[PDB]
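Q: What would this chain look like folded?
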Amino acid sequence: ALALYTPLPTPTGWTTMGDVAVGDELLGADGKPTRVVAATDVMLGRPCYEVEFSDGTVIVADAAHQWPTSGGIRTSAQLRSGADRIVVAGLVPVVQIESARRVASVPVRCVEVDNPAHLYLAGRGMVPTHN
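A: My prediction, written as structure tokens:
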């Protein structure tokens, strides 16, 4: 799950995780539209991590949120500053993880998309992440 204030890119603009509705279009890792097919309620009290990327994108996510990295799937809590790179199989890394750290809990929410790779883009830098 991602913080409600996370901006998510869409084919026409930007939404937030808090504002996104089932049936909205997000972006897959291929940069093409992918539909939100399900979403959770707002979840409160979850342990959260702040993840900073090499492009300046910052995303707050819950500890168990999963990311596509050079060494496989990693939860937020297992990302390694200055080592992990966000990569999507077909080679080229999208960004490097600059910092990942525990922060105070904020409201978060999950979405599921219809992308067969289970990926959508998140943050101002449009970083691939797992639903």
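The chain has one domain: 1-131.
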